[PDB]
Amino acid sequence: EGRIVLVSEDEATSTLICSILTTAGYQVIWLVDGEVERLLALTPIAVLLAEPFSYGDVQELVDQLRQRCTPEQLKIFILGSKGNYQGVDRYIPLPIHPESFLQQVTMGLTSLATSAQ
């Protein structure tokens, strides 16, 4: 299995997306803030940051996460109407399609090595 942390203020969107990831066998931790101290302590394989960003400036957060953990160690994804590329691995514009969402996560994850299985 694996651990993924989701940061957002909207409970409704979170319930739909968490179910998709959990079904795949991944555990999801929902946060309504996005503090680096807590994120670092609960350092997951990947983080999902959804707008509006409670933590504030995503670039600083990404820089801090990247500085502590390499992109290979920790993947960063952003959710919103427009993909704000601030060092994130991939953007997932709304509405998020469940059919391609899982595929995108898998594709991003398999970038680490060709021998996924």
Per the CB < 8 A criterion, the answer to whether 27 and 3 are in contact is yes
Q: How far apart are CA 112 and CA 29, in angstroms?
A: 23
Please tell me whether residue 15 adopts helix, strand or coil conformation: helix
Q: What angle do CA 43, 107, 17 make, to 5 degrees?
A: 60
Q: How many domains does the chain have?
A: 1
Q: Residue 117: CB partners within 8 Å, gap ≥ 6?
A: none
Q: What angle do CA 58, 3, 60 make, to 5 degrees?
A: 15
The first and second tokens of residue 35, run together, are 């503090």
Give the residue numbers spanning the domain of 70: 1-117
Q: How far apart are CA 54 and CA 72, in angstroms?
A: 25
**Long-range interactions of 13-16: CB distance < 8 A, separation 24+:** 13/50, 13/79, 13/96, 14/50
Q: Residue 68: CB partners within 8 Å, gap ≥ 6?
A: 40, 43
Question: H/E element holding 92?
Answer: strand 90-93
The first and second tokens of residue 44, run together, are 């997951």
The tokens 């998709």 sit on which residue? 20
Terminal-residue alpha carbon distance, the chain? 14
Q: Residue 57: CB partners within 8 Å, gap ≥ 6?
A: none
